[PDB]
Design a protein around this motif. Sequence first.
Motif, PDB file in Angstrom:
ATOM      1  N   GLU A  62      29.378  41.767  44.871  1.00 47.31           N
ATOM      2  CA  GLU A  62      30.485  41.006  44.350  1.00 47.31           C
ATOM      3  C   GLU A  62      30.374  39.548  44.785  1.00 47.31           C
ATOM      4  O   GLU A  62      30.209  39.260  45.984  1.00 47.31           O
ATOM      5  N   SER A  63      30.492  38.648  43.812  1.00 47.22           N
ATOM      6  CA  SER A  63      30.557  37.214  44.095  1.00 47.22           C
ATOM      7  C   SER A  63      32.014  36.746  44.096  1.00 47.22           C
ATOM      8  O   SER A  63      32.418  35.935  44.931  1.00 47.22           O
ATOM      9  N   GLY A  64      32.814  37.245  43.157  1.00 47.19           N
ATOM     10  CA  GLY A  64      34.222  36.858  43.095  1.00 47.19           C
ATOM     11  C   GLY A  64      34.882  37.742  42.068  1.00 47.19           C
ATOM     12  O   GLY A  64      34.204  38.539  41.423  1.00 47.19           O
ATOM     13  N   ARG A  65      36.196  37.612  41.912  1.00 49.67           N
ATOM     14  CA  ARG A  65      36.907  38.446  40.945  1.00 49.67           C
ATOM     15  C   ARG A  65      38.137  37.755  40.388  1.00 49.67           C
ATOM     16  O   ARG A  65      38.680  36.828  40.994  1.00 49.67           O
ATOM     17  N   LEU A  66      38.540  38.206  39.210  1.00 45.39           N
ATOM     18  CA  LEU A  66      39.798  37.821  38.596  1.00 45.39           C
ATOM     19  C   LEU A  66      40.615  39.096  38.441  1.00 45.39           C
ATOM     20  O   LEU A  66      40.120  40.088  37.897  1.00 45.39           O
ATOM     21  N   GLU A  67      41.867  39.081  38.886  1.00 44.21           N
ATOM     22  CA  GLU A  67      42.711  40.253  38.691  1.00 44.21           C
ATOM     23  C   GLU A  67      43.779  39.916  37.656  1.00 44.21           C
ATOM     24  O   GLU A  67      44.508  38.937  37.811  1.00 44.21           O
ATOM     25  N   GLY A  68      43.862  40.748  36.628  1.00 43.92           N
ATOM     26  CA  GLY A  68      44.847  40.606  35.551  1.00 43.92           C
ATOM     27  C   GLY A  68      44.323  39.831  34.343  1.00 43.92           C
ATOM     28  O   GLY A  68      43.208  39.285  34.360  1.00 43.92           O
ATOM     29  N   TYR A  69      45.137  39.812  33.292  1.00 43.28           N
ATOM     30  CA  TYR A  69      44.801  39.140  32.049  1.00 43.28           C
ATOM     31  C   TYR A  69      46.063  38.482  31.465  1.00 43.28           C
ATOM     32  O   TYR A  69      46.718  39.039  30.579  1.00 43.28           O
ATOM     33  N   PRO A  70      46.428  37.304  31.995  1.00 43.95           N
ATOM     34  CA  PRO A  70      47.613  36.597  31.472  1.00 43.95           C
ATOM     35  C   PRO A  70      47.391  35.893  30.126  1.00 43.95           C
ATOM     36  O   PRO A  70      48.352  35.385  29.533  1.00 43.95           O
ATOM     37  N   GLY A  71      46.161  35.903  29.616  1.00 49.76           N
ATOM     38  CA  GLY A  71      45.916  35.471  28.242  1.00 49.76           C
ATOM     39  C   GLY A  71      44.591  34.765  28.147  1.00 49.76           C
ATOM     40  O   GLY A  71      43.973  34.487  29.167  1.00 49.76           O
ATOM     41  N   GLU A  72      44.168  34.449  26.920  1.00 49.42           N
ATOM     42  CA  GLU A  72      42.828  33.938  26.686  1.00 49.42           C
ATOM     43  C   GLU A  72      42.573  32.694  27.481  1.00 49.42           C
ATOM     44  O   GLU A  72      41.512  32.568  28.082  1.00 49.42           O
ATOM     45  N   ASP A  73      43.561  31.790  27.489  1.00 54.14           N
ATOM     46  CA  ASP A  73      43.378  30.471  28.076  1.00 54.14           C
ATOM     47  C   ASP A  73      43.326  30.527  29.595  1.00 54.14           C
ATOM     48  O   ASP A  73      42.993  29.558  30.261  1.00 54.14           O
ATOM     49  N   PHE A  74      43.706  31.657  30.147  1.00 58.74           N
ATOM     50  CA  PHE A  74      43.613  31.846  31.590  1.00 58.74           C
ATOM     51  C   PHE A  74      42.252  32.427  31.931  1.00 58.74           C
ATOM     52  O   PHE A  74      41.590  31.977  32.854  1.00 58.74           O
ATOM     53  N   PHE A  75      41.806  33.353  31.108  1.00 62.10           N
ATOM     54  CA  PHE A  75      40.549  34.060  31.333  1.00 62.10           C
ATOM     55  C   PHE A  75      39.351  33.135  31.376  1.00 62.10           C
ATOM     56  O   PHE A  75      38.607  33.133  32.337  1.00 62.10           O
ATOM     57  N   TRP A  76      39.140  32.344  30.323  1.00 58.69           N
ATOM     58  CA  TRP A  76      37.921  31.545  30.244  1.00 58.69           C
ATOM     59  C   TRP A  76      37.650  30.563  31.393  1.00 58.69           C
ATOM     60  O   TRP A  76      36.554  30.579  31.972  1.00 58.69           O
ATOM     61  N   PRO A  77      38.612  29.683  31.721  1.00 60.17           N
ATOM     62  CA  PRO A  77      38.306  28.720  32.789  1.00 60.17           C
ATOM     63  C   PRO A  77      38.257  29.385  34.176  1.00 60.17           C
ATOM     64  O   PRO A  77      37.550  28.901  35.070  1.00 60.17           O
ATOM     65  N   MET A  78      38.984  30.478  34.362  1.00 60.11           N
ATOM     66  CA  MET A  78      38.936  31.164  35.653  1.00 60.11           C
ATOM     67  C   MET A  78      37.615  31.890  35.824  1.00 60.11           C
ATOM     68  O   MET A  78      37.048  31.908  36.913  1.00 60.11           O
ATOM     69  N   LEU A  79      37.093  32.457  34.738  1.00 56.80           N
ATOM     70  CA  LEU A  79      35.774  33.064  34.803  1.00 56.80           C
ATOM     71  C   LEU A  79      34.718  31.980  35.046  1.00 56.80           C
ATOM     72  O   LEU A  79      33.796  32.148  35.858  1.00 56.80           O
ATOM     73  N   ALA A  80      34.863  30.857  34.352  1.00 54.17           N
ATOM     74  CA  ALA A  80      33.944  29.744  34.538  1.00 54.17           C
ATOM     75  C   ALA A  80      33.881  29.295  36.007  1.00 54.17           C
ATOM     76  O   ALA A  80      32.801  29.036  36.512  1.00 54.17           O
ATOM     77  N   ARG A  81      35.018  29.231  36.700  1.00 52.81           N
ATOM     78  CA  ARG A  81      34.988  28.911  38.139  1.00 52.81           C
ATOM     79  C   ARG A  81      34.131  29.910  38.909  1.00 52.81           C
ATOM     80  O   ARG A  81      33.355  29.528  39.807  1.00 52.81           O
ATOM     81  N   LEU A  82      34.275  31.193  38.576  1.00 53.52           N
ATOM     82  CA  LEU A  82      33.508  32.232  39.276  1.00 53.52           C
ATOM     83  C   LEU A  82      32.012  32.105  38.999  1.00 53.52           C
ATOM     84  O   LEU A  82      31.187  32.190  39.924  1.00 53.52           O
ATOM     85  N   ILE A  83      31.658  31.891  37.737  1.00 50.54           N
ATOM     86  CA  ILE A  83      30.252  31.720  37.388  1.00 50.54           C
ATOM     87  C   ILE A  83      29.635  30.524  38.126  1.00 50.54           C
ATOM     88  O   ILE A  83      28.516  30.631  38.651  1.00 50.54           O
ATOM     89  N   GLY A  84      30.392  29.428  38.197  1.00 50.36           N
ATOM     90  CA  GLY A  84      29.957  28.190  38.856  1.00 50.36           C
ATOM     91  C   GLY A  84      29.725  28.405  40.331  1.00 50.36           C
ATOM     92  O   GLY A  84      28.761  27.900  40.911  1.00 50.36           O
ATOM     93  N   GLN A  85      30.605  29.184  40.938  1.00 49.26           N
ATOM     94  CA  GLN A  85      30.536  29.459  42.353  1.00 49.26           C
ATOM     95  C   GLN A  85      29.396  30.434  42.700  1.00 49.26           C
ATOM     96  O   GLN A  85      28.872  30.403  43.806  1.00 49.26           O
ATOM     97  N   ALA A  86      28.985  31.259  41.742  1.00 56.90           N
ATOM     98  CA  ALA A  86      27.836  32.143  41.930  1.00 56.90           C
ATOM     99  C   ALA A  86      26.512  31.368  41.856  1.00 56.90           C
ATOM    100  O   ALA A  86      25.483  31.861  42.314  1.00 56.90           O
ATOM    101  N   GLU A  87      26.526  30.175  41.268  1.00 53.39           N
ATOM    102  CA  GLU A  87      25.333  29.315  41.287  1.00 53.39           C
ATOM    103  C   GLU A  87      25.679  27.871  41.691  1.00 53.39           C
ATOM    104  O   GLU A  87      25.841  26.984  40.799  1.00 53.39           O
TER     105      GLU A  87
END
Length: 95
Positions: free
Chosen positions: A70-95
């Motif tokens: 595990e590198s990081g996680r997002l818990e929940g789905y408050p909507g599309e506009d929350f998902f994308w940039p929060m996932l992007a932070r995780l991807i960025g932090q993994a590299e």
Amino acid sequence: ELRLLMFEQPGCLYCARWDAEIAPQYPLTDEGRAAPVQRLQMRDPLPPGLELARPVTFTPTFVLMAGDVESGRLEGYPGEDFFWPMLARLIGQAE
């Protein structure tokens, strides 16, 4: 070696929302292609070799794995506009 694990359970309305809203676009986007999604059930034993930082206690939970860890996680789905940039932070932090 990035993957996004999506943890689900029966009757989870917010899982079903993500499945309808994000899932169809996901593998067709740069993000989705950077971290392919794999669904699992929260109450099942983990696939062998997979190392999480802490248990999954909420669905949907999206765990970004780098290789088998595990590198990081997002818990929940408050909507599309929350998902994308929060996932992007995780991807960025993994590299």
